[PDB]
Design a protein around this ligand. Structure first.
Ligand SMILES: [K+]
Ligand SMILES: [Mg+2]
Ligand SMILES: [Mg+2]
Ligand SMILES: [Mg+2]
Ligand SMILES: [Mg+2]
Length: 52
RNA sequence: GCGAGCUGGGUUCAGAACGUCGUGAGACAGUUCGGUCCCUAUCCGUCGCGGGCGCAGGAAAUUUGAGAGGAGCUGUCCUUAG
């Protein structure tokens, strides 16, 4: 029975860690996008259209 | 420079879709098809046209020009001369 409890406990911990890593990957991706968005906010379109 | 002068193709309303992201409503680090352009000009300004008076009498013509505007471009060939 102790073996099974350890196995169940180990499995459940891994599931949680996968969730955490998933969300951190999301955050990293969204950050990168946000920085690029702000960086490109001023550099799009032709000269005249930038001045709009 | 110029939308009370015109257009409205791009983009940034509401629809819909692709890629991608999000558990999601939705979103762009990307695209795509469709999407109401209102106003009778008072004043100055600008382009034309009149009326009034003035210009030491009242008229009909012809004029000077202070001043203002307009115009202001350029090719090729022949000759000089192979
Ligand atoms: K998804
Ligand atoms: Mg963008
Ligand atoms: Mg105007
Ligand atoms: Mg349009
Ligand atoms: Mg005024």
């Amino acid at each position: 029975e102790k073996e099974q409890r350890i196995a169940n406990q180990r499995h459940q911990y891994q599931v949680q860690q996968r969730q955490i890593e998933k969300i951190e990957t999301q955050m990293v991706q969204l950050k990168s996008w946000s920085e690029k968005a702000h960086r490109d906010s001023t550099k799009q379109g032709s000269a005249s259209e930038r001045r709009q």
